[PDB]
Amino acid sequence: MSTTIQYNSNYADYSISSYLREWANNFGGSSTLFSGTQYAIGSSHSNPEGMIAEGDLKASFMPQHTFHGQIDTLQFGKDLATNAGGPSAGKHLEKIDITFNELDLSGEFDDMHKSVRGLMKGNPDPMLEVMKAKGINVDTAFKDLSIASQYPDSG
Amino acid sequence: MSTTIQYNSNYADYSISSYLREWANNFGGSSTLFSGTQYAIGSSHSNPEGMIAEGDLKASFMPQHTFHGQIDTLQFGKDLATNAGGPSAGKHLEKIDITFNELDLSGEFDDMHKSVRGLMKGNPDPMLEVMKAKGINVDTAFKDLSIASQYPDSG
Numbered sequence: 001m002s003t004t005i006q007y008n009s010n011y012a013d014y015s016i017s018s019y020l021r022e023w024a025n026n027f028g029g030s031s032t033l034f035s036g037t038q039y040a041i042g043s044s045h046s047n048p049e050g051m052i053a054e055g056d057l058k059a060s061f062m063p064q065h066t067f068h069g070q071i072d073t074l075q076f077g078k079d080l081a082t083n084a085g086g087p088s089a090g091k092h093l094e095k096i097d098i099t100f101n102e103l104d105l106s107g108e109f110d111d112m113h114k115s116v117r118g119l120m121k122g123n124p125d126p127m128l129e130v131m132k133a134k135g136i137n138v139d140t141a142f143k144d145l146s147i148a149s150q151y152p153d154s155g
Numbered sequence: 156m157s158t159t160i161q162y163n164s165n166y167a168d169y170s171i172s173s174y175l176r177e178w179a180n181n182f183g184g185s186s187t188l189f190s191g192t193q194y195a196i197g198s199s200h201s202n203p204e205g206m207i208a209e210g211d212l213k214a215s216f217m218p219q220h221t222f223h224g225q226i227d228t229l230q231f232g233k234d235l236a237t238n239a240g241g242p243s244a245g246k247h248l249e250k251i252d253i254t255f256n257e258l259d260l261s262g263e264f265d266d267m268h269k270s271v272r273g274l275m276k277g278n279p280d281p282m283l284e285v286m287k288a289k290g291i292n293v294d295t296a297f298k299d300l301s302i303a304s305q306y307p308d309s310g
């Protein structure tokens with residue numbers, strides 16, 4: 001498939017060159033920027049299970065040696081789908097089972113891959129150890145778990 | 156900020172452990188999976204400029220030695236914002252100036268960082284060389300550029 005380009009009518013008289021030069025000139029390891037990452041992983045079976053790791057960040061350095069790994073939300077469910085607004089807008093899960101909010105996984109990059117790969121091969125153990133090391137109780141039903149709350153009706 | 160967790164009422168009697176074990180067991184370098192990445196970079200000034208690189212992929216190997224770098228859409232504009240559906244759902248640009256569709260940047264990871272960093276410091280030249288090497292004409296106004304089309308009214 002050949003590359004196609006869409007432009008706002010305000011830039012009709014610009015070239016790619018004159019647009020990007022202007023964008024580059026009007027913009028201003030991180031410093032001093034806003035950056036955000038969304039990773040989506042899903043299976044190939046029907047009603048496929050999926051998960052999303054996401055985070056965003058301010059500006060400059062490690063906080064445990066990762067730039068794109070500044071992850072603070074982790075979500076599990078089924079049916080990854082494209083967001084409104086097109087492919088550029090990333091993904092959402094159609095069926096959301098569990099969402100971890102303010103779960104700082106930045107320090108498990110430099111362990112998150114072992115956790116995600118484990119998950120894909122039927123093994124939650126490394127993910128569970130990461131969660132336990134943050135003080136999360138993984139052996140309590142969600143209904144009794146203090147930091148957990150139920151979504152209204154379905155999402 | 157302390158971690159909080161949200162769950163669908165169907166999993167009220169599950170623990171994190173029994174949920175993730177079940178999810179792990181019902182799931183099934185890539186093989187044989189659906190994976191997707193969204194990178195968002197924005198400035199810290201008012202009406203901040205922003206860009207989004209996004210792609211997704213099927214299953215197993217290099218196609219020029221990158222897994223998360225399987226990028227085929229690139230979008231420039233202003234005002235990065237959170238998608239409907241919460242932080243997990245990633246970002247969109249409120250003001251979209253230009254979108255490159257089916258622009259395969261996977262082979263510029265192993266050059267994309269030099270391009271993005273250039274952009275941030277007022278220099279489009281490395282981005283323009285990547286585009287030129289794909290056969291894109293960067294010195295033609297969008298209105299005359301054959302592969303380009305105008306968005307209706309504003310987006």
Ligand code: HEM
Nearest residue numbers: 029030065066067068069194195196208221223224264271
């Ligand atoms: C905006 C588009 C960008 C894209 C598409 C992109 C993509 C990537 C890819 C594919 C990798 C290696 C593999 C992976 O992601 O798993 C990577 C690594 C890395 N990138 Fe970027 N990147 C972008 C912007 C930036 C910027 C602006 C910076 C720094 C100012 C940066 C800093 C880094 C660093 C430090 C790594 C090494 C691993 C890490 O700490 O995450 N990237 N990027």
Ligand code: HEM
Nearest residue numbers: 039040041053066068069109116184185220221222223224
């Ligand atoms: C689902 C959650 C995942 C997260 C949050 C995540 C995050 C990251 C991060 C932070 C890096 C290095 C820096 C960067 O992204 O720029 C990375 C690199 C890498 N990851 Fe992942 N990853 C995930 C899933 C996976 C899976 C399932 C695989 C393979 C089956 C994988 C394979 C790789 C490889 C090969 C690299 C080296 C650079 C590249 O080719 O992109 N990742 N990942």
